[PDB]
């Protein structure tokens, strides 16, 4: 059953509740990260709990517990879910904001939810995203403001997420780290405009182990005739091939073979970053 | 009178009242809401604000929980209970699922009674600063529950009152407000193509249109700002708030100006046509 750690109890996920003065209710102001297991062990903890804290400094959250705390929280709840996980720890700015400019009472909770993975079907056929002229603002800090990755999908023609394209430039999806494959070079935007994505950061690995060149430039929406392949990474979708990005198909509209490659590679390299 | 909360059928004292985690307003800021202020206890402009209200939640895939003359019912209920001058916020939220649909179906609503906090007197006198930024509200007919920026902005704003959205270097509105630039007599504000449909914004452009001041309907731009005899910015609970500063350019005088001054005395004289 999934759970939620709020003032230092697990509760039953559905029971867990956050007083309406929190200013992450009322203006938004929250942070977060998502950590998901293989074999029970949570990937990239660490690089998770430092984003959290990049993103909670950033955004002049002072941090309700050390990582330390909340790793001994996250295992924890792991180790009560018995099964493969998806952990969120949430970070809110809690009633106020002080004369210091800082929020000093930040509320904290971790959800706990059974892994929900892609369909597998969807790593065999690919999915298609809805490009928009719109730009995550302070990219490197993970907020808990994911409006537009759904107000945008009323004319997203059932595509499986939304590809932030500001002014044509691809920079990332919604809820992923977004890669072109064009003359078997991987293309991806700099952490300049895109999250630091662990998953990025793990295929960057892989591409150096490889050989496979990296440009970190924004792919363009006018380069997507050239390409031969697209996919896009996250802790849980792991590398989800793109088909289709608007009405422009990629390559020959299938999953191609360094996107199918690149997952195997990623699917026995793991271990080393399991915690 | 003790600040409340609408929720679950019941006021609660606003310390009490708590949303489930399971809410995509906490998980994801799936949430719309609206500012509702009074005066002499009546609430100004109530229909326009849960009309608007309704346009963001729809615009944002979100289903109504409640009719908006049940809400309307619950807003006056609350002020009765309050009895004092009242800010009212009415927040709608994603609620627990994004369906297959791609509709929020199980939406949650809740309505917040504080006793008002108007801006310090000392501000309207001396007026206040404004911070511009490279930035701009996507969806602007949308009022969203993201003020994220309008804060965590502060830590460069040198002290700044409130965040101005100056994309590309043409003035759209404050993180709090619409902002107004006075030139040659007359008002320049940015077009509700790129701006929120501010309720004050258009109680000042019929006050513009009864006094015979003309009103550009474009955005002014960071470059005329040396050119400019007076600015202010507008929203529910501020009235209109002078500016006299916005980044390192001083405007005009450096001192709240006479249409300035003058456009918010007729607020306050007019403002009785549009309680409800
Ligand atoms: C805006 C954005 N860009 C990239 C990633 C990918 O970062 P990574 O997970 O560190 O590789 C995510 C999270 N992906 C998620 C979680 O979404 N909150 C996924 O679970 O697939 C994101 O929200
Ligand atoms: C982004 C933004 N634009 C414009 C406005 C003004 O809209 P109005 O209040 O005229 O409908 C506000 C709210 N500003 C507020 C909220 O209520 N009191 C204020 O000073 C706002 O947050």
Redesign the interface.
């Known amino acids: 059953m999934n759970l ?1 750690y ?1 003032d230092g109890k697990f509760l039953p ?2 029971e ?6 929190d ?8 942070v977060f990260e998502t950590i998901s297991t293989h074999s029970r062990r949570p990937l990239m903890l660490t690089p998770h709990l430092k984003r959290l804290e990049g993103s909670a400094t ?3 959250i002072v941090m309700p517990a050390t990582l330390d705390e909340m790793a001994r929280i996250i295992r924890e709840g792991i180790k009560k879910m018995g099964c493969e996980t998806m952990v ?1 720890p ?1 970070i809110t ?1 809690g009633d106020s ?1 002080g004369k210091d ?1 800082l ?1 000093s009472s930040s509320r904290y ?1 971790v ?1 706990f939810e059974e892994i929900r993975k892609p369909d597998p079907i969807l790593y065999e056929k690919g999915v298609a995203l809805h490009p928009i002229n ?1 730009e995550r ?2 990219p490197s ?1 993970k ?9 945008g ?2 004319d ?1 023609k059932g595509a499986y997420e939304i590809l932030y394209c500001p002014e044509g430039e691809i920079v990332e999806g919604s809820h992923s780290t977004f890669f072109l494959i064009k003359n078997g070079h991987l293309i991806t935007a700099p952490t300049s405009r895109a999250l630091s994505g662990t998953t990025r950061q793990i295929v960057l690995e892989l591409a150096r182990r490889g050989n496979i060149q990296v440009e970190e430039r924004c792919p363009l929406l006018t380069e997507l005739p050239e390409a031969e392949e697209a996919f896009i990474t996250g802790t849980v979708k792991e590398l989800l091939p793109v088909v289709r990005i608007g009405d422009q198909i990629i390559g020959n509209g299938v999953p191609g073979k360094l996107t199918k490659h690149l997952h195997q590679v990623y699917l026995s390299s793991i271990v080393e970053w399991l915690e």
């Open positions: 939620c709020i996920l559905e867990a509740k956050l007083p309406v003065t200013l992450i209710i009322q203006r938004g102001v929250g950033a955004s002049s969120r949430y700015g904001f400019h929020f909770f959800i719109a603002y302070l800090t907020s808990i403001n994911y409006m537009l990755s759904f107000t999908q009323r997203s």
